[model samples]
Target: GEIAQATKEIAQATKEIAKATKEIAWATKEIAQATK
Candidate 1:
């Protein structure tokens, strides 16, 4: 559960910071791996 929460955090960062970094896909990739 904690690991899943952490994955959500990373994806939340994707939402919060993507406008600045333009790295939404990159963040999602990290989320994808964390799930896998």
Candidate 2:
């Protein structure tokens, strides 16, 4: 049970990290275009 819980948490955190990364990339691209 402990292992399963830990695995689930890890997967959830990984998804959050991926989503944040995508958002950051989009924001960075927008900023670059605006500055140009």
Candidate 3:
């Protein structure tokens, strides 16, 4: 039972991380354009 809960949480954390990664990439691109 505990293991199942842990697995679900880990999956949720990964989904959030993926979203964050996309946001960071977009921000970096904006910064690059601004510098030019």
Q: What is the C-alpha lDDT profile of model 1 across 1-36, one tens digit per residue?
A: 699999999999888786766677778889999999
| Runs off by more than 4 Å, candidate 2 | none
Pitting candidate 1 against candidate 3, the one with the higher lDDT is 3
For each candidate in the order shown, give its overall lDDT on alpha carbons. Answer: 0.85, 0.99, 0.99
Please write out the lDDT profile of model 3 over residues 1-36, one tens digit for every residue.
Answer: 699999999999999999999999999999999999
Clashes of each: 0, 0, 0
Candidate 2 is scored at a TM of 0.78
RMSD of 3: 1.2
TM-scores for the candidates: 0.42, 0.78, 0.81
**Error at 31, model 3, angstroms:** 0.2
Worst 10 residues of 3 by lDDT: 1-10
Model 1: clashing residue pairs?
A: none
Please report how far candidate 2 places residue 19 from its true position, in Å: 0.9
